[PDB]
Amino acid sequence: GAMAERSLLTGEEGWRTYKATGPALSLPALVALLKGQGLEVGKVAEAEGGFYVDLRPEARPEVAGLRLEPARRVEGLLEIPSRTRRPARA
Ligand SMILES: [Cl-]
Ligand SMILES: [Cl-]
Ligand SMILES: [Cl-]
Ligand SMILES: [Zn+2]
Ligand SMILES: [Zn+2]
Ligand SMILES: [Zn+2]
């Protein structure tokens, strides 16, 4: 199980918002990387300081070389939080 958690991006329960702050990554590179660790990826939003990305509260994400920490504040958003497009929809 896991303690109850809410997205800082959307307010939806069932998500913990992380911030990805390095190294340089495109959004699709970040999402492919996380999916590659078997992580279910929720909504994402590009920001000035990096990317906000929702992961499941059970997750304890570890991606080598990536700084991925629980977000403290949502700021500097450049776009609405949205789910990544599946290839059929892209
Ligand atoms: Cl927990
Ligand atoms: Cl791409
Ligand atoms: Cl933060
Ligand atoms: Zn929290
Ligand atoms: Zn949802
Ligand atoms: Zn975008």
Numbering used by the authors: 421 to 510
Which of the paper's sentences describe this entry?
Hera consists of a helicase core, followed by a bipartite C-terminal extension that contains a dimerization domain (DD) and an RNA-binding domain (RBD). The RBD is responsible for binding of Hera to 23S rRNA fragments comprising hairpin 92 and for binding of RNaseP RNA.
Two of the mutants, Hera_RBD_K463A and R444A/R449A, yielded structures with their entire C-terminal sequences visible in the electron density maps up to aa 510. Although the point mutations are likely responsible for the different crystal forms, they do not per se impose this particular conformation of the C-terminus, and only the far ends of the C-termini extending away from the RBD are dictated by crystal contacts. The last residue visible in the distended conformation is Leu498, the Cα atom of which is 22 Å away from its position in the ‘attached’ conformation. Mutants were grouped into three classes according to their Kd values: (i) with no or only a moderate (<5-fold) effect on RNA binding (K439A, R487A and R492A), (ii) with an intermediate (5- to 10-fold) effect on RNA binding (R444A and Y472A) and (iii) mutants that showed a >25-fold increase in the Kd values (R449A, R444/449 A, K463A and ΔC-tail). Altogether it can be concluded that the C-terminus of Hera_RBD exhibits considerable conformational plasticity.
